[PDB]
């Protein structure tokens, strides 16, 4: 019902989960963020200075500015049917890395190593990620018994 309010409906969102109401563990401060690696935005509550707005709680986008102790972030805000590439500032206590890209980078390293090894052996293996194919034709050994007879349970009443 209500309209504009900088934090509406964030009673549970910014809430420092269900036991960790303590001070900020320092590793989140001590992590190294650089220009152009994919962070993601999850707002804390204890910081009290520099929160992303609740529209950006969960979205994730590139990082392009690095201040003393707060980074700028480019994220895609949904609005009426256009999609905006908006830029914000966030104190570094609300951001964290996102394994989404890091896993891709690891599999890039294995792809390139495999390509080099194909150079060495002359054989063209299949490079990454053929999707999940249907099952193969296999023999199920039944030595041990004849299969169990399975039969419906008659009704009973447990109120």
């Amino acid at each position: 019902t209500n309209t504009k309010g900088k934090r509406r409906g964030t009673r549970y969102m910014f809430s420092r989960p269900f036991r960790k109401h303590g001070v900020v563990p320092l590793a989140t401060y001590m992590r190294i963020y650089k220009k152009g690696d994919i962070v993601d935005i999850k707002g804390m509550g204890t910081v009290q200075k520099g929160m992303p707005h609740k529209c950006y709680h969960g979205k994730t986008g590139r990082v392009y500015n690095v201040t003393q102790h707060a980074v700028g972030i480019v994220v895609n805000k949904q609005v009426k049917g256009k999609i905006l590439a908006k830029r914000i500032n966030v104190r570094i206590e609300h951001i964290k890395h996102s394994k989404s890209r890091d896993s891709f980078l690891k599999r890039v390293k294995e792809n390139d190593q495999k390509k080099k090894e194909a150079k060495e052996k002359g054989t063209w293996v299949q490079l990454k990620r053929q999707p999940a194919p249907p099952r193969e034709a296999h023999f199920v050994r039944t030595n041990g018994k004849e299969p169990e007879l399975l039969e419906p349970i008659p009704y009973e009443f447990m109120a």
């Binding site: 992590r31 690095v66 003393q68 102790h69």
Partner: protein, 292 residues
């Protein structure tokens, strides 16, 4: 009548403080603001000059911040001074100063910064500034790391500071707490500071006991006689220690003896042992009760 608070509910809703913050050895409010560097530089370490003084020893360390642990750049304790001739004096302000000097010159030598960047043996009221470059050393600044928060005018946590700076570390500090200043005088003379650095006050305490009560003197200063200490050398052995420290502040660590391999404590109990011990404790005493 009686209401309890340590119940299943209260434990279920408990919240455990940090390890250090819980056993009471660290303040994180200080640490967070003290040992992180701005994200503009991303990896320029923020060296800390840890100082911590026990009831039997003084420890100066140079560390910094890493995602896993805290890399100790260097360490120097106050119980090793017999290498340099400081026998008695373990948590004296003079001992702290000498330990700080040891750490400073040790660090500069490890970096090859000892042929330059000498402080001074004698009194001072200041640090020593230098000029900074790339590729070759220009300076070395480590931010002080005191105790939890406690300091008043004249503490050895400042004594180690004075030792380090007189050894040649650029450290942000305006000296309004070293022994040698009083809040009402508002101007420090630093001659009293040299007196504390060389322990001349300790010498006066010795003399005060000497001409008051030999019994009380010995009962306060026993090991001093056993070392055969004189108040006369207590202002010069320190100086020659200040020479020896800058003569060679590099550590020469020791061997290790073979292991007796068997003891500190009580290896934990096996599962079957823990599962049949209750069986015995029930059944055996049970058959005894039924004997009765």
């Amino acid at each position: 009548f009686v209401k309890v608070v340590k119940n299943k509910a209260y434990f279920k809703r408990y919240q455990v403080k940090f390890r250090r913050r819980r056993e009471g050895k660290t303040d994180y409010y200080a640490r967070k603001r003290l040992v992180i560097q701005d994200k503009n530089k991303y990896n320029t370490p923020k060296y800390r000059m840890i100082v911590r003084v026990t009831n039997r020893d003084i420890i100066c360390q140079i560390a910094y911040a890493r995602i896993e642990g805290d890399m100790i750049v260097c360490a120097a304790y106050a119980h090793e001074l017999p290498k340099y001739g400081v026998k008695v004096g373990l948590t004296n302000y003079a001992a702290a100063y000498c330990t700080g000097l040891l750490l400073a010159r040790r660090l500069l030598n490890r970096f090859g910064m000892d042929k330059i960047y000498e402080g001074q043996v004698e009194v001072t009221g200041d640090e020593y500034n230098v000029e900074s470059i790339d590729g070759q050393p220009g300076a070395f600044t480590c931010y002080l790391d005191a105790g939890l928060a406690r300091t008043t005018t004249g503490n050895k946590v400042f004594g180690a500071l004075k030792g380090a700076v007189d050894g040649g570390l650029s450290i942000p500090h305006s000296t309004k707490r070293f022994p040698g200043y009083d809040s009402e005088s508002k101007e420090f003379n630093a001659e009293v500071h040299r007196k504390h650095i060389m322990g001349q006050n300790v010498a006066d305490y010795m003399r005060y006991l000497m001409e008051e009560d030999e019994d009380a003197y010995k009962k306060q200063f026993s090991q001093y006689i056993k070392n055969n200490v004189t108040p006369d050398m207590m202002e010069e052995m320190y100086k020659k220690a200040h020479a020896a420290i800058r003569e060679n502040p590099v550590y020469e660590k020791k061997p290790k003896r073979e292991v007796k391999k068997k003891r500190w404590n009580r290896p934990k109990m096996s599962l079957a042992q823990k599962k049949d011990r209750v069986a015995q404790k029930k059944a055996s005493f049970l058959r005894a009760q039924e004997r009765a």
